Each structure stands twice: as C-alpha cells, then as structure tokens.
Amino acid sequence: QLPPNATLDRTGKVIDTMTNFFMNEKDTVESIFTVSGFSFTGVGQNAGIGFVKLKDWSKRTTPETQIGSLIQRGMALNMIIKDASYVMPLQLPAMPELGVTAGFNLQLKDSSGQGHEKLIAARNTILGLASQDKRLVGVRPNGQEDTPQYQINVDQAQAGAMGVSIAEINNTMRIAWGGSYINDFVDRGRVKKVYVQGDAGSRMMPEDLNKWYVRNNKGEMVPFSAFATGEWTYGSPRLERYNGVSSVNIQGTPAPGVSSGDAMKAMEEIIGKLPSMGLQGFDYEWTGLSLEERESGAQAPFLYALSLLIVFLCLAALYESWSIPFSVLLVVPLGVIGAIVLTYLGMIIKGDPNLSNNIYFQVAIIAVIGLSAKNAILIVEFAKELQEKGEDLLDATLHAAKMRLRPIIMTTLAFGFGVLPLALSTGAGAGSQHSVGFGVLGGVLSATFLGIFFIPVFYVWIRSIFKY
Amino acid sequence: EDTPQYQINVDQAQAGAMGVSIAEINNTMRIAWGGSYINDFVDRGRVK
Amino acid sequence: VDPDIAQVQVQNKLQSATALLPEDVQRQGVTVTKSGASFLQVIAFYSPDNNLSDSDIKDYVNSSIKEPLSRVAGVGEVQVFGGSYAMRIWLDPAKLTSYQLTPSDIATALQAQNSQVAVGQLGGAPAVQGQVLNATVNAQSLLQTPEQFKNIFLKNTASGAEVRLKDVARVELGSDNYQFDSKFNGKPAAGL
Amino acid sequence: PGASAETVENTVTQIIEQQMNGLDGLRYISSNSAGNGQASIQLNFEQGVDPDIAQVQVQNKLQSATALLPEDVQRQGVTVTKSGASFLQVIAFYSPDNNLSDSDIKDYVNSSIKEPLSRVAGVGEVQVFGGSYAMRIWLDPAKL
Amino acid sequence: TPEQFKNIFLKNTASGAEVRLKDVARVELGSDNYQFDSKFNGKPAAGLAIKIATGANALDTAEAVEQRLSELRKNYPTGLADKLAYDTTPFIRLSIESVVHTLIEAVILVFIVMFLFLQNWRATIIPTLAVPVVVLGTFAVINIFGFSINTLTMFAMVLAIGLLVDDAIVVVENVERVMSEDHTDPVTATSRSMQQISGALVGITSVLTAVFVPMAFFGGTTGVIYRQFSITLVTAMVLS
Amino acid sequence: PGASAETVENTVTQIIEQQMNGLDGLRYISSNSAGNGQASIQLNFEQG
C-alpha cells in the first residue's frame, strides 16, 4: 500500500525493492510474482501484491528457513522502505476457502450516525492503541484512505449564455480524458477493440483542462475555461457499509506466542477504551474467519452436555437401572482432567500456541469421555451380574475389578498408542494432529491412573445408598 | 363498460399546404397533452 | 412448481421482448413479481397537529425508517404507501407561441442542460514519464434546485431579451402521477 | 459514471441493499461505494444454502430493484456473480531468452489460452494480468 | 492496419483541403488495458489467476487445468514458457501422505502393544486381522453417503484404530484366559467365552457409539467439521 | 437479417461466445453462422 495519490511508477519502484529483498533470500524463496495496481482492497495505482513461492519443505529444514522466520525478516521491510504506507508479508488461512489471509477481521461500525470523520478518528485511536499492544502485530486498515480530489464546478448559467450544452461537455471531456471503446476491428481473425482518448500530454495536470474546447450551438469553439473552474478538495475515495451502517475494516495478526483468541480479546479491550477517550457509540462485529472462530467456541458446552446426556440415557436403557448411569458419569472428570492438563503443559513447555482450545481439542474431549465411560461399564456390568448371582456389593465389585483389570488396561493402552503417532507427527498438518494427539494421550493417562481407582468406589457408594 | 372518447383528425393535405410536418404535430400533442419523462436529478440524494 | 424458478423463467423470457417495447415504456421500468405471502401488519405515520408537511413526513420515513425495519429479524418485504414527488413543468400555450417556441424546444433544452459530466483522472494509466500525482476528477453539473430549472436559457428575443423557462412555464415540485396519496383517519399520512 | 462516492451510496447501494434484505439464508451484507462511480454489494449466506438458489433469488429481487435506480445506472447494466476472492493457482508466462516480446506474450495469453482454460471443468473465474492488442487513437486537442 | 485508420476521412475545409484522422491524432497498436504491471522474478510477465468454482475438488481441477494446458503447450510461439507461480495443491498432497503414514504407524504400534500383552502370535494375529476389515468397510460405507477422503475422515480413522480392536481384544483375552484356567479345546473355550462376554461387548459398543452421535446434528461450518468425525467413528464402531 | 456468414460471426457469434465461460458442468460448445443471418450456439452439459 502506497500513500494517497501515488502513481504507478512509485508503486513499481517500491515493488522492485520488495522483489530484490525476497529474491535475495536464496535459502527460503524460490520465485516471486508481482503485480502493480492490483490488491484485494481494490484496483488503483497505489496498490500492489506479490505471490512468493518457497522452496520445497524437505529442502527447508533449519529454523532459519521456517515460514514464520521469513515473515519477520520481511516485516522489517516496510520499516526500511520509505515511500510505502506498509508492506506486509502475510500467510494463508488454514482453510483457504474461508478467507484471503490469516489473522483477525473486524468491522467497526458507526452505529450512532456520527459521520465519516468521527469514524475515521475512532479508527485512528484504535490503530494507535493496537500498535503499542504487545499481543498484536501488523494491525492496519483494509481499505483506502481519504485522498486529495480535484473538483470541477460547471457554471450552467455561463454555459447556457455561451451557447454550450452540458451534454456536449460530457461527451467531449469524457472521451478526451477518460477514453472510450468505440467499436471493433479484426486482427488475424480475432475481433479486437478500437479506443479513442486524448494523448497523455493533455491529461496529466489541471492546467491541461485549459487545452480542450467545446463546440456551441452556433458551431464555434469555446474553451473549457469559459464555463468551469476546478478546485482541490479532500474526500473519501471508497465508502464502506457492513450491515446497513457506515463502517471501516481493521485486520491484523496475533503476535508470536499468542493465540487467535487472545488477539481477539486484546483487540476488544482496546475497543472498550473508546468511551473513556470521548468517542461514543461505536460498535464492532468480528466478520469472516473471526466470525467462524467465535461460533465454534460458543457451542462446545452444548456439545459436551448432549454427549453426556445421550450416554447417560443409553446406559439407563441397556442396564435397566438409574444407579449404573450415574456411577459411570461420575468418573468422566478423571478422564477429562488428563486431556486438559497435558494440552496446557505441552503448550507452555513447547511454546506452541496451536495447542489451544480449538475444535480438534473438542473432538479429543468427546473421545476421552467415551473412553472413560467404556472403562467403567466394563467393571460395573460384571459387578452387577455378580450381585444378581447373590454376592455382596463389596465382594462382587472387588471381584469384578480384579477380573477385568487386565482387558481394561490393554484396551486403554491400545487406544493410547493408536494416537501416539498423531502427537509425535512432524510437518504437513502437524498442528491439528498434535491437538487431537495431545488431548487423547492426556486423557488416556489420567483415566489409566485415577479413573481405575474411582470406578469401584463410586459404584459401591451409589449402590450402598440405593441398595438391592 | 365502454365510455365516450374524443378523436383528433389531422388533414394531411391542409398541413401540407400550411407547411407543417405530421411528425411535428404528433410531437407537439404528445408532449403537450400526453406529457413526457425527460431525465432525472438528484435532490438531496433522492432520485426524482 | 417452485415460485422462484417460475419468476426467474418469466423475467428471463421478458429480456427478449423489451427491445420491441416503446421507449417510454422502457424508461418507466418493467417489473416482475410473484404472489407470495400477505401483510403481517401495516403501520401509519402522521403528524397529529399538522405541524409537519406531508412531504416532510414522507421524506423522513423513506430516509430514516424504511431501511432499518427491513433489517429486523423476521421481515420479508417492506412496502411504503404514498409514492414520491417529481419535478413538473407546466406549459402555457399563449406564452409559448408569443416567443415562437414549441414543446419540443423545452424538451430539448431540459435534456441538454441537466446532465452529468465525467472527467476521468489526473495521471491516467499511460502517463507522461515523471508524472507525480494521480487523482480522481469529479464534476458537479446536474441542477439541484427548482430555481435552477426556472432559469434554463431558452433563446434570445429580437430586441435582445433573455427567454428562460420561467417565461413560458410554471415550475413546481409536484407529485409522481403513478402513485396517489394515502390518508389515515382522514389526514395525510404515510404507511409501511 | 460521473458520480461521487456519496451520491453512489445514496442512490444505488442503499436501495439495492434495502431490496436485498429478506433473502432466505442471509448471514451478512458487505458493501462499498467508490469515487469512480462504482458500487459493490457482497451477500454472504449461511452454511448449507444452495449457491444456485441463492443466485436466482438475488436475481428475482434485483429485477424489481433495478427500476428504482437512476437511469444512467440502468443504462450501464448491473451484474450478478458468485465467486470467492481467493485464488487456487497463478500461472506465469514469460520469455526465458527474450525471443518473444512482452506485448506478444500478453496478447497470446489473452487470445489463445484464457478462454479454453476458463472452460476447464471446475474453474470458476479467471483473472488476467496483461492486456491484449487494441487500436489506440490518441488525439491532440490543439489540432482538433 | 493503422495506416488505414490514419486515412479515415473527417471533413473538408473552407479552402477545400481534407482533414483525415492522422491530422488530429496519433494512431497505433496498443493495449486494451494499461492499469497493471506484472513481473515474474523481476522480469515482465503475463499472469492467469484461476479461482475455483463453488464446491469442486481442487485437486481434480488442478489436474484438469494441467491437462488442458499441456494440450495447449504444443502450439506455443517460439520463446514462450509457462510455470506455476502460486499453487496450493502440493501441500494437500503432502498432508494426505502424512496422514496415511500416521495410520500405518498406528496399526503397527497397536499390534506391538497387544503382542506384549497377548504374548502368543496366534493370539495377537486375531485382533490384527480386524483392522483391515473394519477400515475398508468404513471407507465403503461412508463413500455410499458422499463423504470423501480428507484429513478429517483420515484423522477419524486413526483415532478409531485403537478403539476398533476393543471388542476383539476382549473376546480373545477371555478365550485365552479360559483356556489357561480350564484346559479344553478351543471350540468349547470360545463358546463359553462368547456366552460370557456378550453383554460387555454390547456395552462397550453402545457407549462408544452413542458418544459421537449428537455432534452429527449440528449446523454451520463447525457442524460440517463435526459430521466427518461422527459418521466415520460411528460406522467403524458398529462394524467392529 | 440481411447479413452474410462472415458478418454474423464477427458481430454476433464470437461476441456471445466470449461470455460463455464459467458455466457449471459444461462439456463443449458448437456454433454456426449462416448466410441467412442466423446464429446458433449450442451448449452441452454433463450428465446430472
């Protein structure tokens, strides 16, 4: 992104420097493909973009050649490059379909109708605060900045007095400065276009408006100066609305060592300081990928509750009891506690923010709930049979514990080595793999050490309070 | 049900003698009696 | 039969026709709709003491009220009653003939003098080497008020007088004939 | 053409948006108005909505919405498309030994390669960087 | 040709000399677009960016693009080269390869642990033969319902491998135990075993299957992500 | 009406064929431009 009113040449020179930087990274970069005048924010002469291809993953094995490492070395670039507004290296999202870039996406709305200037002031406050917050990096506006614009005031009175029609003025100035596609001609058997426009020397600066003449009803030529003035103004090139409300978009990245959720929280606190700075009635909305994240986080409690309920009910139906299901669900926290502990510890020691409360952690938790219930049924159903046979609660449950302690342990360790390769994976999707892996392995361990002890005690307590 | 209507009869011959085209007569009465939409302006961000 | 497909098919077959329609018809607009559901409720907007003009109430509802209600949770469609006003030019045959002017003269002057101009950019893409600045160039040319229409130059009299629109016509912001007025409890009002 | 961003927002984007409210499975509407006279409305739908049905219903509402626009707008014609901004691939075309000129490469890509690839199965849209040949008449005001 | 355009007649002057197009303008062959400037590795280049179509397999469309491009490549002008500057599909291939590798490793490790417990080779092969039948049957069934091979269904399978050997491990273990405690023919021991553990098998399957069922019925993007796990896991549990 | 096959191709057939990308499930396109002025474009789609 270059400053307002910058030409294609300045943008090209900035991109030349950007190209030299990336290509001089011989150990990490393979090719770069750049375009001047194009960005996702829009078409315009002060915008550019580059597609950088790295070398094969097998070639890049040193910490120095990791993708995160290069991003920082390039992020230095915008600091060094003087003409640019910013030059940000960015990464793709985990599922490229759901967004164009990785990071957070926020929509700031003017929900109290205070106007464009107030909204820009609020956005500038937000940008300043986000800049000095250590949990964020690269916070920027995603749009276009208010720019100088040239305004032409046509005197209808003088134009009419001089014999000149505004429709003829439109035709002449439009074709002259903007250009027109008239019709087609055929080249080598292909139909191509014919364009008429004024030559470049006559359409560069406001002095060159004085070069063009309009023909009046009498058929004589009267200069553009005779009925129009021109002046320099300051206005927004591009106005945005999010849901019927005037708005601006703010994007950015979590800082290294920070999670997506933590960055989102960070952003929100900053937005929360607006009322204390004399800026009122501004609300935000979390669009795109950020929207997807918030929605996923939110429904975990219902998912856990529904899974627990359905297991409770199936246990009740199968064993024609209410005590057995309560016994079995009573031991679920022992299984669950390992998953959370191991994921947290792995995060803190590894320094990996991908070991988090993400959606793969939720499926791991559900799997651990299942493992917990399975281990418990194995012993309680045998104890219940033994009690039907006419053995004491205590004696029967101890016997069943003894007899089923061997298959339980081997099935649990089977499940535990079944996920060990995921936890110890490396490269090409290792993040999700570690989420699932770490969750299930922690669950297996705590269920294998705490759960096996709590299964028989809960059974005897429940069946002693409710006898027979 | 049907209602009375009024009919204009233009004498191509008398117009010729008088030196007035048929198209001029038609345009005149089209605009004068029928009305015409010409083009629109923006009055405070409202198209009228 | 799926109503959405039936509507899309009908309005696709419409595209073939329009080039054969009268030009006046084309500028008014040919619209296609389907039956659908009925009104849940109809709201009315009015001033109890006639303090505000009906035009003011219509403007206020159309501007502030109409858009946000569309965005309420369950709303499907929002329809206003009362239409909107139009600029109207009433000719006087006596004055027209006294200046030897016709209705077509007025039509031509109206279209010639109320227009929107385009002017491209400063420093457009094939640019002179060393061009420093690139900027948008917008022009303001359309008439904004009714006095601007009143002063539309028509012609020059033999003695040299300036014949403008006001000299042959009465210019007033009037109604759009197509949609007529609606009244609540016998008073002017706008409904949703 | 010719209008400021504010006029565009007042006269085009807001009225199209007001008509677009009330579609079946709509999630959010993002819109912009530009000083070069261009309006953009993006409709994002809920997961599990049929894209084709979404497109036809947008067209069904837009049919009537188009009558409420300025006439200058109606003349240019408003267009309805469905796509995703991201890119699957980028191909490059270049001359390793400079035998072929840049204008030759660009025209050849536009003439021979773009149309067939855009009809390949599964491809949604094709964006081209580089222009094809055209006949340019560059006028001198003084001589005119 | 440009000379032809240059010659287009405009008007005649009062004197009588004619004004042609060349008299007021410069005529040439140029671009139909001037607003972009593209380079590949610092050298002028043209670019074609492809965007995928609304629910289509990216790998398929990339292969189709390459086939079409390879056909086109025959008629290139001399001195024309093309090369992918930005492609995402190699990563997809790499991640699928990795996930299959984890599946293989997991099956090996499960075999090793159970051979540690069921010390006999005859014993431990019996659970091991369950892995293929269940995995392949699961693939077949979910393919009947339109699910594909993605990383989510493959993570699901890796997660299932350790749980799909449970019923069999239980069955074998009881038979072996029975054959040790009472030294009888395998057939009699196996019959007694199956008479003893039917309820354990059904309870194990019931809880494991019920656990993952509710998440199949959730909406949104998150629901689509949940459904892969749910369907794969549930199908394998029943088959096991 | 009135046109030759060449003018039909140049003014109609390629103009309409240049817009016919991006359609879902398309197999191939056949066109012909006739000396009676008529243009045909037949779009063939995949099964299903």
Ligand SMILES: CCCCCCCCCCCCCCCCCC(=O)OC[C@H](COP(=O)(O)OCCN)OC(=O)CCCCCCCCCCCCCCCCC
């Ligand atoms: C011993 C240690 C562990 C070894 C690992 C295997 C353990 C058993 C589990 C078997 C199931 C393997 C499942 C593989 C899933 C692969 C998913 C996938 O990505 O598909 C790849 C491929 C289809 O796609 P594509 O690459 O385009 O190939 C088509 C043209 N070939 O897919 C294919 O082309 C077809 C692949 C077929 C898989 C065959 C599996 C056969 C298993 C046979 C076991 C025999 C047991 C002994 C029986 C004899 C008597 C005792």
